[PDB]
Design a binder for this molecule. Structure first.
Ligand SMILES: *[C@@H]1O[C@H](CO)[C@@H](O)[C@H](O)[C@H]1NC(C)=O
Ligand SMILES: [Ca+2]
Ligand SMILES: [Ca+2]
Ligand SMILES: [Ca+2]
Ligand SMILES: [Ca+2]
Ligand SMILES: [Ca+2]
Ligand SMILES: [Ca+2]
Ligand SMILES: [Ca+2]
Ligand SMILES: [Ca+2]
Ligand SMILES: [Ca+2]
Ligand SMILES: [Ca+2]
Ligand SMILES: [Ca+2]
Ligand SMILES: [Ca+2]
Ligand SMILES: [Ca+2]
Lengths: 212, 139, 139, 139
């Protein structure tokens, strides 16, 4: 047939509710009055009442805001019966896709990561590794891709730039020189991860390195 | 539309219950999982539970025997919502007609009728009149 | 639209039956399972069963040989409903033309024609006239 | 194929015009923009403009009231071309049947019928005969 396209809807929508999505008509109405109803999850099935149709006009509406994070899609079945009581049209499948929105802040894998390296090693040496995540999309948007960084190593002495972190992978390496277990054995540095490749929202962690 | 014919069912049916009547499908299922339910008298309304549907297949069943003498017809409404929670198809009316069976013995209007006539009258003379009824179909 | 061309078929065809003619697909199948059926004369209407379709694949077939002399053309209507039970596509008209084959011997108008002329007439003179016909194509 | 059912329409319809009948879609639209048009009597052919389609949505409409008594049926052909300019789908036949309504008063065959019989005849004797007609359906 000449079907009916899926209906994209934004998430965390907000204005005056209702909101008409689309209108359907059975043409077999030349004969009697036709009664429009509709069924499915989000319809009469759990979440009941997110969408409802006007039995007499054939309008479909979204009744309240949604979170794709909860349910990212819905499928519905539409009907049309006569006043006498007989169905007129083979039902009709209906689809709605819920488009992502940057509503989610990222989060570190652990609450604290630990590490260790020996004092005499050379600059350009891989030490630790850190993780974190965002729940929003990350396959068509940047709402879910992070960018790692560092902003405060304690013992801001001998110098304060002993390390760096790979923004994409979150791996840390020794960049400077002057490590001594004998004077300064354990650094505590603060890390952050951000939305949209360092553009969106950010959070903190803590990684602590002991020196062999 | 292309509706859906009424469903004739015999009365005082008897075999292994359930009994599948028919199966319905929403085609708008390309997108999510669809949940089939159904409503009305005989459904969720008094007589509750005579008919029920398998939320995931779309099969409709009669759960137990029936007596047209009690209820000779039912009308039901079918639904289909998405997992997310939104309805997909305008509901669908459903009808079932209960075909009669000779389960009823007749019964006299009164328990005793009385009459009277005079002794000298001629053959071919109307005296009394008697009544009785059967509740099964007669049309 | 992008319709669907008429289907030429030879007459007094003969090989292993069935014979696939063509295959149809509703694309609105992303959602549920679609059930292919078809209607008309030669279909469900008299001559019933000359053509039938595979509800699940969408193939159309000719089931047996034909004689254009009997019926030289067919028109059919195709359908596609969802498991839930709703139609998805406005039906679709289908046509088949039956190409002629030399299966018919001719036949004289009468079983015997009579004539008459006078003995003394000149050469190049029109006498009788005779008729006959063939039922196969001649156009 | 999965064709598309005839469309029943009442006669002497009346409300706010337009009136959407049905909507068609070419799926070959993944590539370019498709332009929906339609042709035939009642379309671009005399009666021009009873029905028209929205080149971009694919909706079909009845633009004004109708009288089956005038034309009781219509047949139409639908199209879909690309912006570049090429057709995508073999066109598609479309049918509409106009359902009768009691808009017609009957009328006597003649304006006056005459008759004659003899005075002495017996009761139960056939004299005249009278005619009249209605143009609405009677089948
Ligand atoms: C690292 O951890 C130790 C242990 O608590 C703490 O005293 C120190 O201030 C932190 N930072 C550095 C650079 O040592
Ligand atoms: Ca959200
Ligand atoms: Ca989101
Ligand atoms: Ca995010
Ligand atoms: Ca040292
Ligand atoms: Ca009984
Ligand atoms: Ca009975
Ligand atoms: Ca009885
Ligand atoms: Ca032949
Ligand atoms: Ca022939
Ligand atoms: Ca011949
Ligand atoms: Ca009229
Ligand atoms: Ca009329
Ligand atoms: Ca009339």
């Amino acid at each position: 047939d000449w079907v009916i396209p899926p209906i994209k809807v934004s998430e965390n929508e907000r204005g005056p509710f209702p909101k008409r999505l689309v209108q359907i008509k059975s043409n077999k109405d030349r004969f009697n009055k036709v009664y429009y109803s509709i069924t499915g999850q989000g319809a009469d099935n759990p979440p009941q009442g997110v969408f409802r149709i006007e039995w007499e006009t054939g309008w479909m509406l979204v009744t309240r805001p949604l979170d794709r994070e909860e349910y990212d899609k819905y499928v519905l079945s539409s009907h049309a019966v006569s006043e006498n009581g007989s169905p007129v049209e083979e039902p009709m499948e209906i689809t709605i896709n819920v488009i992502d929105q940057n509503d989610n802040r990222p989060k570190f894998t652990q609450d604290v990561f630990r590490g260790s390296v020996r004092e005499g090693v050379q600059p350009g040496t891989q030490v630790m590794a850190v993780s974190a995540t965002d729940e929003d999309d990350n396959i068509d948007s940047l709402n879910g891709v992070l960018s790692y960084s560092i902003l405060k190593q304690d013992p801001e002495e001998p110098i304060p730039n002993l390390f760096t972190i790979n923004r994409e992978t979150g791996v840390i390496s020794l960049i400077g020189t002057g490590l001594d277990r004998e004077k300064f054995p354990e650094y505590t540095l603060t890390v952050q991860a951000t939305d949209l490749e360092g553009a969106g929202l950010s959070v903190e962690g803590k990684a602590i390195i002991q020196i062999t």
